[model samples]
Target chain A: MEKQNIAVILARQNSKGLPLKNLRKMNGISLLGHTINAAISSKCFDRIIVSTDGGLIAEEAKNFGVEVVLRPAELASDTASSISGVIHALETIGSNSGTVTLLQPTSPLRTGAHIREAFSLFDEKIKGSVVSACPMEHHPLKTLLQINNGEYAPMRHLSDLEQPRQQLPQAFRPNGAIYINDTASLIANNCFFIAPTKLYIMSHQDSIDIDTELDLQQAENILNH
Target chain B: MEKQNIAVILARQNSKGLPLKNLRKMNGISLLGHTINAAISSKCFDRIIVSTDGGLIAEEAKNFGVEVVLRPAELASDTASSISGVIHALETIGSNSGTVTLLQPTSPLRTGAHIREAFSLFDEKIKGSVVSACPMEHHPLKTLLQINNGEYAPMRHLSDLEQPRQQLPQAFRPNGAIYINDTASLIANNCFFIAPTKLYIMSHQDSIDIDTELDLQQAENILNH
Candidate 1:
C-alpha cells in the first residue's frame, strides 16, 4: 500500500498587522486560495484540510473542494500558538497517522512545484521532518545588536568580520511555507521542527510570507511580474 | 577654524551586473546626479567632486554643478578597488587634508539629510570614519552554509538555533551609501573601515545599493511609491 499524506492549512482571520490577511488576494486569488490550490495541485496528499475560525475562510476552503475544520475562537486569536491550532485540526479530523504537511496561507508565492519537491525530500528522510527554508539575503556574521539606548554593536565573531562575503558561510531562513512530518512526531514533538530534519531550499522571492501591508504589496508585485 | 569636508562621488562607466550603472536614472535623475545633488544639498562639504572615466558621467557631473575628476582606465575597471579610485581622485584634486566622504552613485535613494546626519556623527566621534549600515532583515544566528554537495548545515551556535528571533541580537549590513573619513586616516588605513569607526544607521529601504536590473526595478518601484 502507498503511504498516505495529509496537508493542513492553518489560517486565522484576525491579523493584527494585516486584517483578514488570509483572505487578502494576490493576483486575484486569496492567500488561502493560493495555498489550497498548491496543496491540491501537488497531488501528493491523500487528504487536504483547511483549519480556520473565519466563516469566509471555511466557505473558501469548501469552494476549493477541501475539508474545512472550524477551529475554536480561542485557537483563532493572534496570541494562539500555531501548534494549538494544528493539534486541534489533527484531532478534529481523527488523523493520527500518515504524513502531515503544514502549509501557511501567508506564503502565497509557494507553488505546487515546491510542495511536490518538499514531499519528495520527506520521503528520502524516511523519518523526522522536511522544512522549507530560503537562502538568507544577509549574512548572519555581519549582523549587529543594540548594546545600549540607541547604541548598536556587532554581534559577529571578530574574525568573521574581517572575512570577505564569499568566504562566509551561507545562511537560510525558515520561510513559513512548507513543513512535513509524520502525524505521530508532529503531535508528540508539538512542533514541526522534528530532529533529523531535512531542508527544502527555496528562493527568497518565492519564500515571502505576508505579514504587513508592504509584504502584501511585495507579493502582488512579484505575481504581476 | 571650522573643519572642512570634501565629498567624492565615484561613478565608474563599466559595471558587470548592470552596464553604465552610474548613468542609469531613478525618478528622472541619473544615479550620479542623485549623489551629486545629495552632496550639494547637504551643505556639509566645502567641495563636491565627481570621479569618473566616462564622458557621459563627467557631463552629468558638470550639469549637476560639481567638478569632475577624470579617472584612469586602470582605476575604472570593475576589478579595481574602490580605495584606488578614491585615492586617485584625492591625489588628482591635490586634496591631502580635511575630511573625505566617499559616496557611491549606485545608492540613489540616499539623501542630503542622511549625509548631514552622518557628518554630525563624524564630528562627535572626532576621529575615525562614519560608515553607513542598515538593520539586517534576518537573524544571523539562523543562517546556514552548504557543508557538502547539496547539503547545507547551520553555521549558527547550537543554542542560537533554539532562541526566538526577537530574543536574538539584531544584525546590520553596510549599505554602501555613505563613508566619511579624514583624509589622513583614509590614506593611511587604505580603507573606509578605520579603527574606532562609528556607524550612521539608515533604514533598509534608504540603504539600497543598486547592482542589478532587479535592483533598478526595485528602486523605480520605491520611487513610484
Candidate 2:
C-alpha cells in the first residue's frame, strides 16, 4: 500500500463557553497553533489542513505553513458535527491517496510521537480504521443506569452469575485525540468517523479533550508545568 | 503553630483488573513500595502512615519501617469514600498535632521534593486545606450542562459576556496526589474533605492517579521508559 496522505483537520469556531476556544493561548502559543506545530513537526503527514470558518484561525494556520480549508458557514455552525467538517476538508483538499488522520486542536498535549505511533500501528496490525483511545477511569460497559422510577439497571449483562467488579472484564474509552480512517472506508460511509477500529492507547495526560472553559484551563495548567 | 505531624495515606487494595493493583512490580519494586520509598525518603513528614485493610498490605508497609493503620472492614469497602478512610486513619493514629496530609499510592511519579513543597505551601498559607491541584485544560467556570429537558445550559451565567477563555478567572482541579488539612476543620465538618482550599499546583505528569488496570499498565510503561 502507498504511504497515506494524512490530513490534519482542525474543526473549530468561536465557542460560547470558551470564547475563541481554538485560539486560546496556552504557555506561549494558541491551542490551535500548538496542535498545528505538533502535526507539522511529526513529519508523518503529506499535508496538514486546518479546517475553520474563522479568518483568524485560517490566518494562524497559514502562519505555521499549514494549509487551511475555509469551511462554509452552514458547516461551521455550533450545531454542526465535526465529522462533516472533516469530510468537507478532505473533499476540499482532494485527498485521493493514503489515510486521513484527524487531530483535534483541543488535544494540545498529544505529541508528535503519539501521532507517528498511531500511524505506524494503523499501517501495521490494524487493517481497518484506527483511532486513539485512553483507558477510561470508569468502564462504561459495567456502568449503571437509573430507570424512570429511579431503580438502577446494569448497562450490560456479563453473565447469569453475579460477579464482583474486579472479576469483570476491563473496557477502554476513546480519548478523541487521533482518528485514522482508510480514505476509502470514510468515503464509502460518507462519514469521517470510524468504527470497528483499532485503538491506539495514549496516556491519560495526553487524552484530555477541551470542550468547556474548565477544560481549557486544565490544558493551560498542564502546558504551564 | 507547632510543626505538624504529616501523614501519607496510601489507600490501596490487592485485587486488580490486571494482576497486582498495589503490588504490581514497577522499576524493580511494587507500586505501593515506590510510594512508601518516596514517603520515607522525604524528610518533611514527621510521620508516614500506610492506611490499609489487608494483612499483606500491612506487611508491605512494615517492610519500609512505616507506621501501619489497619483500616476497619466498613472503611475498606469499594464504595467507601477516601476522605472518610483518611479521617479514620487520622483518628486511629491520634496525632496531637492539628495537621494531616493525604498522599495517594497511584501518583508514584511524585518525588520527595514535591511532598515538601506541598507541605510548605500548607504551612505557609495556613488555609482550611491545601490540595495539590492542577490547572484544567479549560476554564470550568464557563462549563455547560444538559438540563433535565435536554436543553444545554451554561453552568454559569456568562453567556452574554464575550470575554476570552484565557482572560476568564482561573480554575483548578484536585489531582488526587497530596492534600493537607486542618484537623480542626475536618472534625467540624465530620469530613476530611474541604473546599475553598488553597491549591499547591503540581505538574500533570507527577499528579497521575491510577484507579484502574489500564492506569497500572500505563504506569508500568512509563517506568519502563
Candidate 3:
C-alpha cells in the first residue's frame, strides 16, 4: 500500500497578545493561511486539515483549499490541551493513515522546505516520531535556579561533566514546527510526539515562533531578511 | 573605596567558519570594534579590556582606544576556554572592581542601550552576577535526547509539567552579551559566571550572535531593523 500522510494545522481563536492571532495577517497573509499554504506547497500530504474554534480561522484555512475540523468549545478554550485538539481531530475524522504531521500556527517563520526536510526524517518502520528542534544559545550546564537570596548552584550536574560548554555533547531545544508520527504510534503513545523520536534540526530563522511582542518584532526582522 | 567596573571583550583571532571573524568588518566597523564602541558608549565601565592572542586584533582594539591583553598562545587556541582567558585578564590586570562584564565580540547586534540597562540590574550587593539571555523559541520541556541507538526521552521531565508550553515555566538562554560579576566573586567562582545570578532579558534582535554564515545574514537583518 502506498503510504498516506495527513497534515493537521492548529490555529485557535482570539489571542490576547495578538488580536485575532490566527486570522491576523503578517505582511498581508493570515497566520493560519501561511500554515495551510505551506501544507499545500509541501505536496507531501494526502489531506490537509485545520482544527480551529473560530469561524474566521476556519474560513481562513478553507480559503487555502484545505478542510477545517470545526473545533468544539471545550477544545477551543485556552486551557484545552493541544494534544486534546489533535486527538479530537484524529478521532473526529477517524483518520487512519501511514503517518500524521502536526503544524502549529504559532510557528510563522516555519516554511514548507522545513516541513519537507522534517518529513524526510520520518520512517514508519524505524521511528515512532519526528520532532524539530534548534541548538540552544546557552548550554544547560551553565544554568542556575535562583534561591531566596544571592546564593546559586548549577541547574544541572554541571560538575558531573568536565567538558566545557562548546566541547560538551551537543544539546537542542524543541521548536514547535513540524511533528510527524504514524497514526498507530500516535494513538498508542497518546501524546503530541510519539516516543523513539528522531530529531530534525532547523535553522534559528525557520525555528522562530511568535508568542510575545518582542517575538513579533524579531519575526518581522527575520522576514525582512 | 570606590569600586571600579571593568569590561572584558573576548574575541579569538580566528574562526573556522568565517574567515578572520574578529577583524571582519560590517558597516565599516570590525566585529571587535562594535563591542569596544558599545562598551565605551555605555559609559558604565571604568576600564575596558580586550583579551585576545591575535596581533591584528590587539592593534584593532588599540585603535578603538581600549586596552588589549596579549593572551598567551596556549590560552588563545581553539580548544582554550573563554573562562581561562577571562581569568587571565583578571589576574593580569589585577582588576579590583564592583563587577567585570564579559562582552563577546560575536554579539555585534548588542547595543549600548542594552549594556546600560543590564547594569541597572547589577548592584554591589544582593547579586553575584548578571548575564544576558533571550527567551527561547521552544520550551526545554518539549526537548528530547537521542540515546541507545534511536531511543529517546524528554531532555527535561515533561510528565510532571502538565501545563501547556505557553503556561509552562518561562525559560531563557544566554545571549553572550552582558555578563557582570563582581571581581571578588568572579575569582571565587573560578568560572565565567558567578551564581546567585540575575538574568538581564534582552530582545531577540539584540541577542543575535554570529557563528555561522546564516547567523551573519540574520545579524545583518537585525542591524537593518
Question: How accurate locally, in lDDT, is each candidate?
Answer: 0.81, 0.67, 0.76
The total number of steric clashes, by the backbone 3 Å criterion, in model 1 comes to 7
Q: How big is the positional error of residue B173 in model 3, measured in Å on the Cα after superposition? A: 1.1
Candidate 1, residues A15-131, lDDT tens digits: the string is 667788889887888999999999999998998989988899999999999999998889988678887888888888787788899999889999999999988887544576788
**Model 1, runs deviating above 4 Å:** A1-4, A17-30, A63-65, A94-98, A123-128, A155-165, A208-225, B1-4, B17-19, B24-29, B62-65, B94-98, B123-128, B155-165, B210-225
Residues B1-225, candidate 1: write the lDDT tens digits: 345578988887777678888888787888888889899999999989898888988998988899899988999887788888889888887888889999988888899999999888885346767888887776666655667765666655534554677887666677889989988788997877765567889998898888898898898898876
TM-score of the A chain in model 1? 0.90
Q: Candidate 1's error at A69, in angstroms? A: 2.3
Instruction: Report iRMS (Å) of candidate 2.
Output: 15.6
What is the CAPRI rating of model 3's predicted complex?
A: incorrect
Per-prediction TM-score? 0.82, 0.51, 0.65
Model 3 chain A: weakest 10-residue lDDT segment is A144-153
Q: Score the docking of each candidate (DockQ).
A: 0.34, 0.02, 0.18
lDDT (Cα, tens digit) per residue for candidate 3, span A1-225: 455688988777855467676766777787787788788888888988999888888787777888889988888786777777777887777775578889988898888888898888888686567888877765654454444343333445534223466664466666788888898777776775555567788887888788766776787677887
What would the per-residue lDDT of candidate 3 be over residues B107-176, giving only the tens digit for each residue? 9988788899889888677655788877665454555554444445566664522346666556666677
True contacts kept of 3: 0.17
Task: Kindly give the stretch of ten consecutive residues in candidate 2 chain A with the minimal lDDT sum.
Answer: A153-162
- Tell me the deviation in Å of residue A38 in model 3: 13
In terms of TM-score, which candidate is strongest? 1
True contacts kept of each: 0.44, 0.00, 0.17
